[PDB]
Amino acid sequence: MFKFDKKQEVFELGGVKFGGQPGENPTVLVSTMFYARHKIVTDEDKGIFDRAAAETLWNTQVSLSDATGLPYVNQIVGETPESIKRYIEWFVGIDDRTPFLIDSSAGNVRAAAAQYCTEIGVADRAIHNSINASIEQSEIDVLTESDVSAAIVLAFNATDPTVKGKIDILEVGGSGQTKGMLQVAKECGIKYPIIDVAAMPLGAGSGATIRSVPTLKGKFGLPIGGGYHNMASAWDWLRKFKKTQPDPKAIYMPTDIGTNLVAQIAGSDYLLYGPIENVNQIFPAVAMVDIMLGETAKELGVEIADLENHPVTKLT
Amino acid sequence: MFKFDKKQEVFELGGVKFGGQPGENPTVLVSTMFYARHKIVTDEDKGIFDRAAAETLWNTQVSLSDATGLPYVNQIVGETPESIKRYIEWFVGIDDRTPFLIDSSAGNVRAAAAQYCTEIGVADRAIHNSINASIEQSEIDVLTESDVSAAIVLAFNATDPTVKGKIDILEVGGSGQTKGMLQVAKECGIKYPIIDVAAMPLGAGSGATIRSVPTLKGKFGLPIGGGYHNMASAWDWLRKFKKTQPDPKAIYMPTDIGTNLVAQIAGSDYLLYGPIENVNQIFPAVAMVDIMLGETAKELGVEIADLENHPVTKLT
């Protein structure tokens, strides 16, 4: 519903454009496959899953992306070096253009994932997730040797759940570090930093998450986004209220698909909308808020990159 | 995430406070009842309806509003002068404090309801919902005699589908030259002018609808809202895609509910969320954005009117 004065940078990773003024480029819906307790992953430690039944989940996002025009990016979660290596190996053989966040909670795996991506040549399509404030010295070493050029920087200021804390952990750095997390990325060889707001639980710093979306875009200009569905997933009241009603998912879904829409209208450029199995409910909701953003942009004077494949044209 | 410079006017209508800075007051949730093809309504012309399940649809919202903290207001919808009088008599006979919007498409019915509420004694509660450019001399002359001090000023320029067009019908006046609708209402007794942004359908004026929420609020200072769910219910593409999915409602509801959360974060003070049967899905979603709006209010400097009953403290 607004345009930004600070010239927004747009990063074209593997045919997907991250960044730009609100409405210039469509929102980049980032799915999540092989997450914790995925129904297709049989052997989580060894990375053994149902390869035939996973291509159907991906082809559901591919076909719905061609109707709405919303670009899609995978996020291959893994917890062991062997598992994430077989997950990455499968993904690049079924599709050859779409980027993938190599996400993991253990820095050893992201260390292993970074080496494998450059080993087999698919490194310009890999987004390292994420360069947070707890990154150790070993993780920098493997990242800078690797050929990964795009990475997600997590605007996490642990003892500062405020907008100024998120700015400070990227600008000056927080506690336990001396350089801003947006400059640690530069020395890691990341030419394409992509800020993550690090959404906080509801009632413990959730308002700063949504007010940092138009603040970390009008201050840095780099692509801004994150996983906002974690706010409704950590909500204790909803987890209790939704069980009383006959359909637990009928009530939780509008709230879970409402965190993205609220942040999208505030200027978010990509949405870690969670499990891949929610494709048919997030795309209609997100492409709607992209018609709203693609209308103000056409009226506020913002130029749209590809108007023919915008949700404001295909779906109107 | 906003804090308007223009001082926002708070109107108290039977305990439901309309307006204020984003986060100052909990979002009002107007709920349409007795609408077209309501299951309870059996004779749409003599206003028969169930009158037993009708309480069940109204007690549900009271209990939810006493769990979330969001104010609740009814919107009585009638098509004939006899039908609308039948609904007001029932509603005032079950609830004695909550206001209502006597809504109707025809002018002669709205005037009849506004005149009827004066004779019954409940007209400080009526929120008679039309002050539009398509108003005849008959309706303004009966609304002046009736003791209705609140009205929903609808900012609908048929000629100009822009945000400037919304301003001009309120301040200067368009089709129906001079005496803008915000200045017609003052001269027909309306003491509490509540602004409606007149949500235009998706693809034509749906961008000006969301950018008018922070525009008309920061220009006039009066409470801002509207029926944003009409943007999604009148979407042609969604109707086609929805009917192919196994569960048509589970695809549509996140989109329909998302029209309100998107406009709520912009600064909307009340939300016409549609049928009252959707009360279990809009309250959790709207209350989630009030926690988010109730935290930036305590960070930007806004003073929450009653912290002990805000969704930021009742929930979480």
Partner: peptide, 27 residues
């Protein structure tokens, strides 16, 4: 015309007449 405040820290602010999200100049 409304200077809608969204970030007093970095001085960021909206501008409702133009729709821009600018930064209030102290000058």
């Amino acid at each position: 015309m409304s200077i809608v405040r969204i970030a007093p820290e970095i001085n960021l602010v909206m501008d409702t007449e133009s729709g821009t999200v600018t930064q209030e100049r102290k000058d």
